[PDB]
Symmetry: D2
Subunit: 352 residues, 4 copies
């Protein structure tokens, strides 16, 4: 089979590979629609997770089951499925402690395009189908369902980690796709004021749609001063770090109130340092909690978010600004995430 | 001053009373708009909180400050305020443990028409004005703002106590005003499926507006079987008890999954004991947590809910089906809560103004 | 093989049964030491969980692995293991939500002598060996190690559900073996005052050892009034329900403060009603949270409690008052739990495999 | 009255001062025993909290009430009291949100020797006596009781923020007085393995007393390698940062497991920034939560910790290595915290 792969660091290309075979508890899936993620750009062109050889990329897909192992009981060939980007090994001690994302190692619940061939191929492999797949509703648009696999679960996890209260003020730094879902998720945890911080105009209309009450552009002043001006010097209750470089941590600490929470869902791949400013952190005693986590996956998470979409708790269509048709456009779409034209949020490639 | 009072158990009426005077840290407030609560029907006609003599009723009001004590620093006469129904004494050991609602005693954070003259008078008294009042925005409709003081904070507390997750399935038993904010709150905590249980048609359209995805009527079959049929025998993640008798706890325990949470905000005014169905509670070992709490009050809560309204997170106007103009209609409005016509959710009395 | 079984309701006896075989992920264990639980007396003589026929009893054992399935990777024949009484199925949606105890159904994590042949036999079956077993330290006395599997994990779960704070006052109702570990667990969560409620003298000394600061006897006065007298009318922050009848729930609600937490680990097997007293529950608005749960099992829990014993955080030997030697004494030991002589807390039967 | 004060940065001295007068809700207290804190050395000689002029130092005291305001109801002159180092303003919006320590500002619940004349004087002022004092039990040694006001509440808060579970493995970095109470607190939250990190033998012996199962000395190797060797490369569940430089945060992140919690109770007085190591933090996605908080105060905290001492849950006497008798020795004791002989844990000055 053909697949679009990281040959090595700074090298992309189509490769031929043997089709994966399903173990007793696994499924082989054919993609129906996929989306590129900025995490693959960090991975390929920055070596943020180390070096790889012939690793098929991509981890956002909805697909059709083509083969199942003899012990798979809830899915069969022909079933259409939402595939969460995180597919844990459920029999691990980390699962017993409540951390499916790190089953058998740090980030090891995220396999696709981390250390396992991803979804940019004619077929891909899902471990433990009954625990890690969910049925795609018959009338749900493919582009919407692909947004569940990563953008929605990651952005909402930012809001869950932030422990938002009814009426909390929230700053979301970085209003790309993940930050837009952080804004939506904060609204769905009861946030009052939500300030988005970014410089891209396409995201402003989407950010307001999902629930932003204020938009700040760093280009017209240092952002902490801008936030202090908006909040009369009081700061905000919660900060979600969804995009930008490592210096946003220092910004988040400086704008959150004592007792507040900072929630990172941004993947920090770069040579910039994550620095906590000492004085604004109350010399370590200001109860400014800092969290950061890989998104949950598995069947339960996927089915619960699927129900949110089905009952219209969030309209995911606003994330998808570009739609391509055909394997041939996977390369162009991924390179789009590297260059980022001003009007791109997420791109979806539809396979026929 | 004039006030509408509980004369005793089973007796309502207008009374004349001396005006309250503010202590050094208190405010005297004038109502601008008020609403009757079903809890006052429990208090007066069931003696659910004991006996009272000439207690002015009501605890849902927005008003104008007319007088403040010498140590009040953030409010002055003329300020228009949202008055939370719960107004705690903030200097207590219960406050140090995080339970403002019970500062200096069980439920003692709720004073108005519990053991303190309430808001159905020409003036009423608010303890610790700086800690217990919030400014009413100039452009907020009065009838919407009165819904903050009790319905919203109670309904949202129900959803807060339920510890809802992104996509949790939720049943709300009782879709009166409080349950409607339970539905709204559950949606604003990320609930997926929301099943409302009630028999009153007026609440059906409001429930759908606030986020209900299914509506069950108990009159056409035992409600647990109905929920089991909707959920393929699996039950739901969370139950909020917002209305009905003591038997709703048994229904909630029976329809919630093992590991789930039951969140009671219903004020149970009759019966000696609430019954836990033993087998459906896993004989005590099914991890079906049971909670129940008085709504939070105080300035911080009121300002945070106010911000939710100001930023259009919830539209409170759908709660208000009846609006009167004039102080004197407090009597008719409260009596409406006793008789409950088919089309009532909440009534607001707006006092005459220019 | 021989196994000590519930022949029917009200009938105990030895039966011959096929020796279990392990599936690919399972282990077969030979018991080295076992303990009878009061719940098995309830099952046989009260039919509290329904009717069973020829179910081998017992769910407290440490043992030796004799056979493992072809996919077992961390345990091998010859390993000595602690077997938690709760051995969940780990591949379920309830596990993904964090409730191992109810994987694939309410209380379905408790298999032994619930709906699965238990440990009172020559061999028994453990599902998912890699997820549900823990290595027994070579120098840990067997009778101590058996107390981990049920008594320690249940009592400590009572203290965990109670969400104790540094200095909380705690009442533990029923200071049998489980309540004794409830006392120990409460101390190990930072409790200040710990009031034990019981009438059995043997438990009083153990209760003081494990951390009780006061002991109240229900027989000489209404306990709620007694607790109010001890606390100058203020009540307590937390209640752990570990023994007694269904009426202890109402008593717990009446003695806990507003905002407090009641934690049930007592299995209410009788048809007596569980009642929340309305006025003392603030008519539903007093923030008196009621929790209740089956004890966690699995490898991680067993290893974490094992480390606590190894590092001397709790001395389990005070639970064991009776030690037998020989498979034959299982009947006598189990019947001891039915009658409960004045000097019994827990009994352990030590097995001596031979030809 | 006389008091030992921070004249400015790098200037200590005795000053003459007016005796404070109690407002309607306050108490004036005469100290019976006091203790110097390392935090005062940060404040004076590092200017960690800004500049001060003639601020009386000290915030660990037990005393006798000599005067109360007209509205004080539970305390009267002659009462002997434990005075928590944190004495919040209880009527603030931060109290309504559950953060007494930051009432009316970051760290502002801690007044003594922060921005209020402290306890190293003949008298000092306690705001809101009914809310901020606790009765000293008749039979409690004074030197033990002084350890409640700061060392016990701070160390235990470290264990509380750490969210310890029954059997959690815990590393405590820095085994001075606060770290010793972190060890004691971790044990009283049910920790199994407790690893103490320090190089001072007296603190090692005390750490074993309070519950440490292993002791690591930084002098025989990088402590992360040592912890990884002790845990066969698995790491620990929880880390409490109780002493050391800013780099201890990086060390904590490297030794804690994915999903673990790092709890800072160390007052960081120097440096611009604390660095979070990127890869060891899972590039932001390892669910390694970082907390850090000023100790709780107020009457309820002091009474609950007092009950723990009365019921022998913790023996505080092992904290006290140096005892002076006489007001005159306040200067010598505080300078001891600056020099720190190898066998010092805490010093107490007993006043007559
Ligand atoms: N597979 C996974 O586990 C996973 C999934 C989703 C996201 N992530 C990570 O989360 C992050 C979010 O993804 P995305 O698609 O939103 O990224 P993105 O490329 O859209 O960047 C986010 C936004 O932040 C803005 N930004 C850049 N610098 C900024 C600054 N200094 N201040 C404020 N805003 C700034 C950019 O304009 C951009 O719109 C990514 O870095 C990604 O690697 C990982
Ligand atoms: N102390 C306070 O401040 C406070 C605040 C809010 C609410 N409360 C209490 O909360 C409760 C809710 O108040 P409300 O204004 O919604 O009352 P309500 O009169 O609207 O009653 C709620 C609804 O529940 C329905 N119901 C009755 N029996 C039922 C059953 N067996 N199953 C299902 N549904 C049933 C009724 O049809 C009604 O429409 C009240 O009992 C009130 O006392 C107290
Ligand atoms: N299935 C399981 O895994 C499991 C595990 C542990 C415990 N449990 C359940 O937990 C309970 C604890 O068992 P145990 O071994 O401690 O039983 P036990 O026989 O030791 O009984 C506990 C104590 O409660 C006392 N008591 C009786 N009535 C009382 C009252 N009114 N007030 C206060 N105390 C009273 C009894 O005298 C006894 O002292 C059992 O009922 C059991 O069913 C179940
Ligand atoms: N708000 C308050 O008043 C308050 C309360 C409690 C604690 N604190 C702060 O908490 C800290 C506690 O100080 P203490 O007196 O308990 O301890 P301490 O002053 O003895 O210092 C901790 C010890 O750890 C050791 N150490 C140094 N570097 C290390 C490293 N890299 N790894 C391991 N160990 C190392 C040193 O021997 C040092 O003495 C202080 O810095 C203090 O400022 C402040
Ligand atoms: Mg970015
Ligand atoms: Mg479109
Ligand atoms: Zn991604
Ligand atoms: Zn009301
Ligand atoms: Zn048992
Ligand atoms: Zn200090």
């Amino acid at each position: 089979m053909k697949g679009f792969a990281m040959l090595g660091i700074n090298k992309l290309g189509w490769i031929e590979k043997e089709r994966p075979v399903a173990g007793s508890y696994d499924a082989i899936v054919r993609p129906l629609a996929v989306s590129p993620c900025t995490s693959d750009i960090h991975t390929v062109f920055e070596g943020a997770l180390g070096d790889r050889k012939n690793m098929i990329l991509g981890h956002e897909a909805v697909g059709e089951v083509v083969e199942v192992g003899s012990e798979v009981k809830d899915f069969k060939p022909g079933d259409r499925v939402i595939v969460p980007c995180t597919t844990p090994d459920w029999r691990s001690l980390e699962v017993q402690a409540g951390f499916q994302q790190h089953s058998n190692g740090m980030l090891a619940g995220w396999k696709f395009s981390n250390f396992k061939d991803g979804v940019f191929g004619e077929y891909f492999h899902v471990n433990d189908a009954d625990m890690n797949l969910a049925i795609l509703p018959k009338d749900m648009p493919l582009e919407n369902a692909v947004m569940i696999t990563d953008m929605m679960t990651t952005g909402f996890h930012g809001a869950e980690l932030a422990d938002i209260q009814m009426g909390s003020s929230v700053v979301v730094i970085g209003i790309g796709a993940v930050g837009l879902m952080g804004i939506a998720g904060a609204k769905l945890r009861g946030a009052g004021r939500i300030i988005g911080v970014d410089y891209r105009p396409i995201c402003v209309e989407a950010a307001k749609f999902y629930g932003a009450t204020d938009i700040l552009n760093p280009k017209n002043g240092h952002i902490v001063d801008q936030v202090m001006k908006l909040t009369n010097g009081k700061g905000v209750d919660r900060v979600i770090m969804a995009g930008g470089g490592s210096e946003t941590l220092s910004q988040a600490v400086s704008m959150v109130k004592p007792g507040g929470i900072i929630s990172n869902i941004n993947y920090h791949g770069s040579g910039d340092a994550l620095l906590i400013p000492r004085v604004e952190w109350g010399c370590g005693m200001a109860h400014k909690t800092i969290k950061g986590g890989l998104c949950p996956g598995g069947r339960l998470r996927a089915e619960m978010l699927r129900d949110m979409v089905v009952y219209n708790r969030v309209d995911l269509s606003k994330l998808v600004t570009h739609v391509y048709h055909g394997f041939d456009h996977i390369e162009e779409a991924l390179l789009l995430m590297k260059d980022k034209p001003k009007d791109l949020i997420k791109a979806v490639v539809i396979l026929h």
